[PDB]
Design an enzyme around this catalytic site. Structure first.
Site, short mmCIF file in Angstrom:
data_model
loop_
_atom_site.label_atom_id
_atom_site.label_comp_id
_atom_site.label_asym_id
_atom_site.label_seq_id
_atom_site.Cartn_x
_atom_site.Cartn_y
_atom_site.Cartn_z
N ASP A 178 -3.30 7.12 3.62
CA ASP A 178 -2.86 5.79 3.97
C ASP A 178 -3.75 5.32 5.13
O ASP A 178 -3.54 5.72 6.28
CB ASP A 178 -1.39 5.84 4.40
N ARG A 179 -4.75 4.50 4.80
CA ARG A 179 -5.74 3.97 5.75
C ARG A 179 -6.87 4.92 6.18
O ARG A 179 -6.69 6.14 6.26
CB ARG A 179 -5.09 3.32 6.97
N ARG A 218 7.26 -3.47 9.53
CA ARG A 218 7.46 -2.16 10.14
C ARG A 218 8.40 -2.33 11.33
O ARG A 218 8.64 -3.45 11.77
CB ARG A 218 6.11 -1.58 10.60
N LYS A 266 0.80 -1.24 0.00
CA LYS A 266 0.00 0.00 0.00
C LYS A 266 0.83 1.29 0.00
O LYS A 266 0.56 2.21 -0.77
CB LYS A 266 -0.99 0.03 1.18
C1 LIG Z 1 -4.26 1.86 11.20
C2 LIG Z 1 -3.71 0.95 11.76
C3 LIG Z 1 -3.06 -0.13 12.43
C4 LIG Z 1 -1.87 -0.60 12.02
N1 LIG Z 1 -1.23 -1.65 12.65
C5 LIG Z 1 0.09 -2.11 12.22
O1 LIG Z 1 0.95 -0.97 11.93
C6 LIG Z 1 1.61 -1.21 10.67
C7 LIG Z 1 0.85 -0.39 9.64
O2 LIG Z 1 1.55 -0.48 8.41
C8 LIG Z 1 1.55 -2.73 10.48
O3 LIG Z 1 2.61 -3.37 11.18
C9 LIG Z 1 0.19 -3.09 11.05
F1 LIG Z 1 -0.78 -2.92 10.12
F2 LIG Z 1 0.12 -4.35 11.51
C10 LIG Z 1 -1.77 -2.27 13.77
O4 LIG Z 1 -1.21 -3.19 14.36
N2 LIG Z 1 -2.99 -1.78 14.19
C11 LIG Z 1 -3.69 -0.74 13.61
O5 LIG Z 1 -4.78 -0.35 14.04
#
Ligand SMILES: C#Cc1cn([C@@H]2O[C@H](CO)[C@@H](O)C2(F)F)c(=O)[nH]c1=O
Ligand SMILES: C#Cc1cn([C@@H]2O[C@H](CO)[C@@H](O)C2(F)F)c(=O)[nH]c1=O
Lengths: 306, 311
Positions: free
Chosen positions: A109-110, A169, A17
């Site tokens: 992004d989200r 990440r 993404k």
């Molecule tokens: C928005 C958002 C979120 C992202 N994330 C994480 O943070 C990173 C987002 O890229 C990734 O490691 C993940 F998607 F797993 C969460 O654990 N919880 C969330 O609510």
């Protein structure tokens, strides 16, 4: 009044993404709002992502109870969603009714539902959040504004594992169980929007969980046939049933678009570009809305993007 | 269209809010006034196990140095999420029924507390007690639902000495006078914040300068909730607030500024409080409802809620 196009790129992490969209503003009338990594790692708390994966790992190893893990996961998810919630709230008054070229395109992004629904629900499936906490997050999902275009991903699981391995990440652990849970949740999300839009009534179909649109057992509603949520006679408590009524209202007016990630970064970019022709634009509410929104978006990026 | 009167009785615990609410409701005909209680059953059983007890035990173990601030924070934060859930859902289900601000109301709803109690006041107080981060408080603030038209909030006035006496007598609770002082301060700040905003105060303009409402002159920003958020955690190297936190204060201003605040003197008998509250309703803002069937719908919602979650 001028027009705005909002585009939320969402779906399971590790599909590509943050690359795809990085190449999309790669400019005056398009702004990219990146994931608020700096908030997650520094401003809101210290290394929230590490905290999240370490907690699940310790639960899995049996070093902490489901109870300890849930309180940790819950407060961590609060930290995660904060930038999305503030941004939605400051943007909301600027959004007008549905609406030609857009004066401004915001690519996020989200969407707030990632941290207020999808990740909580996945963690519930991972045994590290209570379904009651999940529905507390659901109850707080902001009302769905006009022009809420959300892009979700399609990627075969094996290829997703390959991409995820390279897209960890900071503090993240490569967890195939979480990968499967989050993919299931987003799959159920897309199904749920479709179920609702085709006129599905969860209260009407609720009995089928104990027995043209997806089956309710193939939507997010199935997750909340959790015994914690049910009275001794099997009925959902009303307070939970109302959270589900809210869930239904919020999801029904979202415009979902599927982005095939099983292609090249430039391909993904082009495909995302193609998708925009079907997205819904809105007017803004004031003449100064456009530059204000621009400033919000750019300040977010600068301050909270990696 | 028929009209609705919504009244949220709020403020520190131990003042007599709950009694006053019942007494007021007992005056009306059965089906033109409904009581929306604290969701005690949710707090104690449905949402989690003995949440109130968890809150007070956690603060105590922090005070005793048996757990870290970090551990206390994650428990307190999760617990506050649990505390607020029934308030949030109820607000979300009521919202589409409420029309514009507007003879006696077709229906009066008296609530035991507004959403801001769990989404703002208690978290802010816990932050003052060292058991929540100011970042988490601002996450709760960011999630405060849009303020519906005709949001009348009644806050309490009560001398600290009488309040302490009342608490030391009239669960899971433990007698914490520090928390009592904190929550009293927070609701006092709240009252001032609404008046400050309605008098045209702009926190951004007054930031560098760092009770009662619906009356009096504009408070100093240092006497409003804004003062709580001059915390080192929220400040950039240059000494200003990070924008993300600043935006949360903008949301705080937006939500509070459209509210109608009234102050009720609890330093009197239960019937006295009731009649004082009754007089106060005269100057309260009603709203239209959006459908004709909204009145019975709302009624059923309030009664269903009361039956399932009231104590
Ligand atoms: C928005 C958002 C979120 C992202 N994330 C994480 O943070 C990173 C987002 O890229 C990734 O490691 C993940 F998607 F797993 C969460 O654990 N919880 C969330 O609510
Ligand atoms: C609403 C509410 C809340 C009530 N309470 C407590 O619940 C008890 C009953 O109101 C009382 O001890 C209290 F008000 F202090 C919280 O600790 N946090 C809240 O958010």
């Amino acid at each position: 009044m001028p027009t705005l196009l909002r585009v939320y790129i969402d779906g399971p992490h590790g599909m590509g993404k943050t690359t795809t969209t990085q190449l999309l503003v790669a400019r005056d009338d398009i702004v990219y709002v990146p994931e608020p990594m700096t908030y997650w790692r520094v401003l809101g708390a210290s290394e929230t992502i590490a905290n999240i994966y370490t907690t699940q790992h310790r639960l899995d190893q049996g070093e902490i109870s489901a109870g300890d893990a849930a309180v940790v996961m819950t407060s961590a998810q609060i930290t995660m969603g904060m930038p999305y919630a503030v941004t939605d709230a400051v943007l909301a008054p600027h959004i007008g009714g549905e609406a030609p070229p857009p004066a401004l395109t915001l690519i996020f992004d989200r969407h707030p539902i990632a941290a207020l629904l999808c990740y909580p629900a996945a963690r519930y499936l991972m045994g590290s959040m209570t379904p009651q906490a999940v529905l507390a997050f659901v109850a707080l999902i902001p009302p769905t504004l006009p022009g809420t275009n959300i892009v979700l991903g399609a990627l075969p699981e094996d290829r997703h594992i390959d991409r995820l391995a390279k897209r960890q990440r900071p503090g993240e652990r490569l967890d195939l169980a979480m990968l499967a849970a989050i993919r299931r949740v987003y799959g159920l999300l897309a199904n749920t929007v479709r179920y609702l839009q085709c006129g599905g009534s969860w209260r009407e179909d609720w009995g089928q969980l104990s027995g043209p649109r997806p089956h309710i057992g193939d939507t997010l509603f199935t997750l909340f046939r959790a015994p914690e949520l049910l009275a001794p006679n099997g009925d959902l408590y009303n307070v939970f049933a109302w959270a589900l009524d809210v869930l239904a209202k919020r999801l029904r007016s979202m415009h979902v678009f599927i982005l095939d990630y099983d292609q090249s970064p430039a391909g993904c970019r082009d495909a995302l570009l193609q998708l925009t022709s079907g997205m819904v634009q809105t007017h803004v509410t004031t003449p100064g809305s456009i530059p204000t929104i621009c400033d919000l978006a750019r300040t977010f990026a600068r301050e909270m993007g990696e």
